[PDB]
Design a protein around this ligand. Structure first.
Ligand SMILES: CC[C@@](O)(C(=O)O)c1cc2n(c(=O)c1CO)Cc1cc3c(CN(C)C)c(O)ccc3nc1-2
Ligand SMILES: [Hg+2]
Length: 565
DNA sequence: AAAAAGACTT
DNA sequence: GGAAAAATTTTT
DNA sequence: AAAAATTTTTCCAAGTCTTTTT
């Protein structure tokens, strides 16, 4: 079939859909109690735990290998939640987590993991088929005239929360989501999904102002989780396409905005100076619009508008550079942002004023928040917000770098290296850093041995040609000449193979501490990539895999070699 | 407002 | 998403 | 065949911006 929704008339404002029907979520299988021979110990004595308490105990047992289970916060949160799950008799015996012995439970689960990787082809194939039919039955939904895939129709099973970074709620229990916690959304004329027998949905609504199918409240942060359509859908795709179109409009007025905030660094009002400086950071350094967050509820991370005095250090001179600002702080996902950046004199002077009479814990930009900044951006350009700058700067950088680095004569592998370097420049800018691949980085040794093996074949082929040429001199004829030809060809193929391996070796090295995934899927206008591929004859499958090819179908079909962001 | 909530994005 | 699993594939 | 290196799914959150409450 293949529906090209991008050729349809743009979907109106307000209403998200007219018709919506789906089968609801897929609940995680019920908890299976431990077999008789897997004992739990408390104070050195065997103790049978009721299903509810035993289940929570298995979560802790499966995480016994991780260092975070030794953490104070983790253990405090865990035991407090585990206690709520216990019967009154169990609560009287188990006064603390340290007297407990989860060793046998831990070994059992490891044994099941070994047993599973030893299953027969009959078992394995059968499990795969049950999944496929579950995908056909619950993985799709009908939205206005078309059938579309649902992203995460299977609700995540219960477990223990860990989060990212130093989270205050790690160790807490993510309780099992039940039909009773589920809010279903569908059209008034669709067939309403039936909850499992003996249960009822929390609510059944018909809200065509939203795009979700199922929603529920998660107990850790108290936020609402959703089941929405997949990236290849029209509702997600159209919104992504609009995001890039917004970034393009920003392109034709960014210099106007830059000239304005540069002047604003001189304004009589402090609020205006701070807003102008913040804008400068978001634009030049692509920092995020740090929305304030509740203290003690989330890991301590910050963005632009939430920077504290302690997050920057001013240096009149550093490394022979003038007016250097030293940024050091934890951003999203607790990823450390460290950068020494030379700034304009007026910005440096402004920052010194913003740090006057303040404590290290106080905000750098008092009198400033994301709401005020975005309100201003909305004045400059309709639909402009803080994050649009990240999309714009990432996209313009990719386009520009692809234009400057691609060599017309290079073979596909070399062009891919160029594409990857351009993507890498975007990643470094967005600070999408990564830690060296868990000792598995030594797989560089494997490539090195392969390159050395190839260098040996190439050297062998050189001696063949060297002796073929020598034999061509003595008794010069067209028969020996064709041998010199066939030897040269063999040297050529080997040189290309070597070149390809060396390029792959360089690609991996330069990409040791960088994560390309996020920019690739969220910050780069796919049309830029599509245009580049078509222009140089690089098969799109070399850049985008199957799932990515589905998400960006709109760009792949609607974008020629002459597309310009 | 300005927190609190909800609904998207990354 | 991106590190860890798991499924495959390649080396030996 | 059996260990080793890859390619491919499986697991699990945190921000931004808009919309309602208080
Ligand atoms: C790791 C980078 C990033 O945090 C980011 O901000 O750059 C992220 C994370 C996650 N996703 C992304 O697209 C991206 C990149 O843009 C999707 C995603 C889904 C996750 C789900 C699945 N949900 C949505 C059902 C979890 O349950 C828990 C953690 C998850 N983390 C992520
Ligand atoms: Hg960026």
């Amino acid at each position: 079939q293949k529906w090209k929704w991008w050729e349809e008339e743009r979907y109106p404002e307000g209403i998200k859909w007219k018709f919506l029907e789906h089968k609801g979520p897929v609940f995680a299988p019920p908890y299976e109690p431990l077999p008789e021979n897997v004992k739990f110990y408390y104070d050195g004595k065997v103790m049978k735990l009721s299903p509810k308490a035993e289940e929570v105990a298995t979560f802790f047992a499966k995480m016994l290998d991780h260092e975070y289970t030794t953490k104070e916060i983790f253990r405090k949160n865990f035991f407090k939640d585990w206690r709520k799950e216990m019967t009154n008799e169990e609560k009287n015996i188990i006064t603390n987590l340290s007297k407990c012995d989860f060793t046998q439970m831990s070994q059992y689960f490891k044994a099941q993991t070994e047993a599973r990787k030893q299953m027969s082809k009959e078992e394995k194939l059968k499990i795969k088929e049950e999944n496929e039919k579950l995908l056909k039955e619950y993985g799709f939904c009908i939205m206005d005239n078309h059938k579309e895939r649902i992203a995460n129709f299977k609700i995540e099973p219960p477990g223990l929360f860990r989060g990212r970074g130093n989270h205050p709620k790690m160790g807490m229990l993510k309780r099992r989501i039940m039909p009773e916690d589920i809010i279903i959304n569908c059209s008034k004329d669709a067939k309403v999904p039936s909850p499992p027998p003996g249960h009822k949905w929390k609510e059944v609504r018909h809200d065509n102002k939203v795009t979700w199918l199922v929603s529920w409240t998660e107990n850790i942060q108290g936020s609402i989780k959703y089941i929405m359509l997949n990236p290849s859908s029209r509702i997600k795709g159209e919104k992504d396409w609009q995001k890039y179109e917004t970034a393009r409009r920003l392109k034709k007025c960014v210099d106007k905005i830059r000239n304005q905030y540069r002047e604003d660094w001189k304004s009589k009002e402090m609020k205006v100076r701070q807003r102008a400086v913040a804008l400068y950071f978001i634009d030049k350094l692509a920092l995020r619009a740090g929305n304030e967050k509740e203290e003690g509820e989330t890991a301590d991370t910050v963005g632009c508008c939430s920077l504290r005095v302690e997050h920057i250090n001013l240096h009149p001179e550093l490394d022979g550079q003038e007016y250097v600002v030293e940024f050091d702080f934890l951003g999203k996902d607790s990823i450390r942002y460290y950068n020494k950046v030379p700034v304009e004199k007026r910005v440096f002077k402004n920052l010194q004023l913003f740090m006057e009479n303040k404590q290290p814990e106080d905000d750098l930009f008092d009198r400033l928040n994301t709401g005020i900044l975005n309100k201003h951006l909305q004045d400059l350009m309709e639909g402009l917000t803080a994050k649009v700058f990240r999309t714009y700067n990432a996209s313009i950088t990719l386009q520009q770098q692809l234009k400057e680095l691609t060599a017309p004569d290079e073979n596909i592998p070399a062009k891919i290296l160029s594409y990857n370097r351009a993507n890498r420049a975007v990643a470094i800018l967005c600070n999408h850093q990564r830690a060296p691949p868990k000792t598995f980085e030594k797989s560089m040794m494997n490539l090195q041995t392969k390159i050395d093996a190839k260098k040996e074949q190439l050297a062998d082929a050189r001696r063949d040609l060297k002796s073929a040429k020598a034999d061509a001199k003595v008794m010069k004829d067209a028969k020996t000449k064709k041998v010199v030809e066939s030897k040269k060809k063999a040297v050529q193929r080997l040189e290309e193979q070597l070149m390809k391996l060396e390029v792959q070796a360089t690609d991996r090295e330069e990409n040791k501490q960088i994560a390309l995934g996020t920019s690739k899927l969220n910050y780069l206008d796919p049309r830029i990539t599509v245009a580049w591929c078509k222009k140089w004859g690089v098969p799109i499958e070399k850049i985008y895999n199957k799932t990515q090819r589905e998400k960006f179908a709109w760009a792949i079909d609607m974008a020629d070699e002459d597309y310009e962001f």
